[PDB]
Design an enzyme around this catalytic site. Structure first.
Site, PDB file in Angstrom:
ATOM      1  N   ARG A  54      41.738  25.359  34.460  1.00  0.00           N
ATOM      2  CA  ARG A  54      42.674  26.084  34.858  1.00  0.00           C
ATOM      3  C   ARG A  54      42.084  25.871  36.843  1.00  0.00           C
ATOM      4  O   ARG A  54      41.120  26.865  36.925  1.00  0.00           O
ATOM      5  CB  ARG A  54      43.012  27.200  34.748  1.00  0.00           C
ATOM      6  CG  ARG A  54      44.072  28.104  35.059  1.00  0.00           C
ATOM      7  CD  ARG A  54      43.739  29.775  34.303  1.00  0.00           C
ATOM      8  NE  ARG A  54      44.695  30.847  35.432  1.00  0.00           N
ATOM      9  CZ  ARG A  54      43.968  31.834  35.717  1.00  0.00           C
ATOM     10  NH1 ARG A  54      43.215  32.708  35.040  1.00  0.00           N
ATOM     11  NH2 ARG A  54      44.558  32.934  36.205  1.00  0.00           N
ATOM     12  N   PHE A  59      42.565  30.802  45.577  1.00  0.00           N
ATOM     13  CA  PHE A  59      41.905  31.827  44.211  1.00  0.00           C
ATOM     14  C   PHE A  59      40.423  31.513  43.367  1.00  0.00           C
ATOM     15  O   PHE A  59      39.654  31.662  43.928  1.00  0.00           O
ATOM     16  CB  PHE A  59      43.289  32.331  43.492  1.00  0.00           C
ATOM     17  CG  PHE A  59      42.794  33.200  42.046  1.00  0.00           C
ATOM     18  CD1 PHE A  59      43.621  33.495  41.338  1.00  0.00           C
ATOM     19  CD2 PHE A  59      41.207  33.655  42.425  1.00  0.00           C
ATOM     20  CE1 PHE A  59      43.359  33.973  40.247  1.00  0.00           C
ATOM     21  CE2 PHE A  59      41.353  34.836  41.472  1.00  0.00           C
ATOM     22  CZ  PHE A  59      41.906  34.350  39.832  1.00  0.00           C
ATOM     23  N   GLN A  62      38.423  26.882  37.476  1.00  0.00           N
ATOM     24  CA  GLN A  62      38.384  27.943  36.106  1.00  0.00           C
ATOM     25  C   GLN A  62      37.664  26.458  35.567  1.00  0.00           C
ATOM     26  O   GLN A  62      38.570  25.769  35.219  1.00  0.00           O
ATOM     27  CB  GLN A  62      38.907  28.881  35.798  1.00  0.00           C
ATOM     28  CG  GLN A  62      38.576  28.938  34.566  1.00  0.00           C
ATOM     29  CD  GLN A  62      39.119  30.316  33.810  1.00  0.00           C
ATOM     30  OE1 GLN A  62      40.255  30.971  34.518  1.00  0.00           O
ATOM     31  NE2 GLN A  62      38.992  30.915  32.446  1.00  0.00           N
ATOM     32  N   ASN A 101      36.566  35.643  31.130  1.00  0.00           N
ATOM     33  CA  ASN A 101      36.676  36.413  30.182  1.00  0.00           C
ATOM     34  C   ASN A 101      38.507  36.277  29.833  1.00  0.00           C
ATOM     35  O   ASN A 101      39.523  36.417  30.399  1.00  0.00           O
ATOM     36  CB  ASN A 101      36.006  38.392  30.546  1.00  0.00           C
ATOM     37  CG  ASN A 101      37.023  38.809  31.009  1.00  0.00           C
ATOM     38  OD1 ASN A 101      37.928  38.874  31.437  1.00  0.00           O
ATOM     39  ND2 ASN A 101      35.683  39.456  32.104  1.00  0.00           N
ATOM     40  N   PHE A 112      34.655  30.159  36.421  1.00  0.00           N
ATOM     41  CA  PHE A 112      34.822  30.108  37.966  1.00  0.00           C
ATOM     42  C   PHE A 112      34.107  30.333  39.423  1.00  0.00           C
ATOM     43  O   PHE A 112      33.223  31.099  38.740  1.00  0.00           O
ATOM     44  CB  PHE A 112      36.791  30.418  38.167  1.00  0.00           C
ATOM     45  CG  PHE A 112      36.245  32.542  37.873  1.00  0.00           C
ATOM     46  CD1 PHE A 112      36.036  33.322  36.713  1.00  0.00           C
ATOM     47  CD2 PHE A 112      35.955  32.959  39.294  1.00  0.00           C
ATOM     48  CE1 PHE A 112      35.956  34.719  37.011  1.00  0.00           C
ATOM     49  CE2 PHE A 112      36.397  34.180  39.043  1.00  0.00           C
ATOM     50  CZ  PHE A 112      36.371  35.279  38.431  1.00  0.00           C
ATOM     51  N   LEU A 121      38.480  41.138  41.569  1.00  0.00           N
ATOM     52  CA  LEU A 121      37.516  41.210  40.337  1.00  0.00           C
ATOM     53  C   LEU A 121      35.871  42.096  39.887  1.00  0.00           C
ATOM     54  O   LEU A 121      35.712  42.012  38.726  1.00  0.00           O
ATOM     55  CB  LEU A 121      37.062  39.592  39.770  1.00  0.00           C
ATOM     56  CG  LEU A 121      38.671  38.484  39.572  1.00  0.00           C
ATOM     57  CD1 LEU A 121      38.190  37.232  39.537  1.00  0.00           C
ATOM     58  CD2 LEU A 121      39.956  39.423  39.200  1.00  0.00           C
ATOM     59  N   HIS A 125      34.754  41.200  35.534  1.00  0.00           N
ATOM     60  CA  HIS A 125      34.019  40.258  36.018  1.00  0.00           C
ATOM     61  C   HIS A 125      32.319  40.132  36.552  1.00  0.00           C
ATOM     62  O   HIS A 125      32.568  40.177  37.621  1.00  0.00           O
ATOM     63  CB  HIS A 125      35.083  38.915  36.664  1.00  0.00           C
ATOM     64  CG  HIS A 125      36.315  38.447  35.747  1.00  0.00           C
ATOM     65  ND1 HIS A 125      36.647  37.311  34.847  1.00  0.00           N
ATOM     66  CD2 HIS A 125      37.510  39.295  36.156  1.00  0.00           C
ATOM     67  CE1 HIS A 125      37.701  37.651  34.727  1.00  0.00           C
ATOM     68  NE2 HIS A 125      39.103  39.014  35.580  1.00  0.00           N
TER      69      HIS A 125
HETATM   70  N1  LIG Z   1      36.165  33.453  26.932  1.00  0.00           N
HETATM   71  C1  LIG Z   1      37.340  33.669  27.310  1.00  0.00           C
HETATM   72  C2  LIG Z   1      37.930  33.669  28.754  1.00  0.00           C
HETATM   73  C3  LIG Z   1      38.145  33.680  29.937  1.00  0.00           C
HETATM   74  C4  LIG Z   1      39.919  32.965  28.583  1.00  0.00           C
HETATM   75  C5  LIG Z   1      39.505  33.387  27.575  1.00  0.00           C
HETATM   76  C6  LIG Z   1      40.879  33.254  26.244  1.00  0.00           C
HETATM   77  C7  LIG Z   1      40.791  33.535  25.295  1.00  0.00           C
HETATM   78  C8  LIG Z   1      39.703  33.728  24.540  1.00  0.00           C
HETATM   79  N2  LIG Z   1      38.491  33.760  25.058  1.00  0.00           N
HETATM   80  C9  LIG Z   1      38.554  33.783  26.938  1.00  0.00           C
END
Ligand SMILES: Nc1cccc2cccnc12
Ligand SMILES: Nc1cccc2cccnc12
Length: 164
Positions: A54, A59, A62, A101, A112, A121, A125
């Site tokens: 992603r 931005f 990830q 997360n 990311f 964030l 985060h």
């Molecule tokens: N740990 C995580 C980071 C970012 C997205 C997620 C999506 C579903 C489960 N865990 C995730």
């Protein structure tokens, strides 16, 4: 001192170069340690061979889902998930390394690298380091992203590990 780790990244089978990251173990030791061990692969699993799944221009980039390879997976060295250690480090600008997360206290392995100041964030985060070297590689990765996060090239962490 703080660990230095690296990610060697390919895009469509061609090397982009190396991203070197400082892990701020002095501030977030538990979070730093998780990322360090996932780079070395010393627990029998980690980032090697996984992707940037992603990427959103202007931005962030990830990565870190080495189980499901789509943004739903990943796991930590402690178990499937672990708490937000603290929000002491801030999303101050490009090059910031932060934990992805799915809400409070759901850190696993996804992370990311910011390409802008992502100040919204802050407090949500866990920031745990930054780019020492290889922002050029990060900008290349960023350029293969899109509005939806879907990547236009297949971006792979071919190698990773600890430098110090
Ligand atoms: N740990 C995580 C980071 C970012 C997205 C997620 C999506 C579903 C489960 N865990 C995730
Ligand atoms: N000390 C630093 C040097 C270069 C980039 C950085 C990005 C975020 C935090 N600290 C940084």
């Amino acid at each position: 001192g703080n660990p230095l780790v690296y990610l060697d990244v390919d895009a469509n089978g061609k090397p982009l170069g190396r991203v070197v990251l400082e892990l701020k173990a002095d501030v977030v030791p538990k979070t730093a340690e998780n990322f360090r061990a996932l780079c070395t692969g010393e627990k029998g699993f980690g980032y090697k061979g996984s992707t940037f799944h992603r990427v959103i221009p202007s931005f962030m980039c990830q990565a870190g889902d080495f189980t499901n390879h789509n943004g739903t997976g990943g796991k930590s060295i402690y178990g499937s998930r672990f708490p937000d250690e603290n929000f002491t480090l801030k999303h101050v600008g490009p090059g910031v390394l932060s934990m992805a997360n799915a809400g409070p206290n759901t850190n696993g392995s996804q992370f990311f690298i910011c390409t802008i100041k992502t100040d919204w964030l802050d407090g949500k985060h866990v920031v745990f380091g930054h780019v020492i070297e290889g922002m050029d590689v990060v900008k290349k990765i960023e350029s293969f992203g899109s509005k939806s996060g879907r990547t236009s090239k297949k971006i792979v962490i071919t190698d990773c590990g600890q430098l110090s």
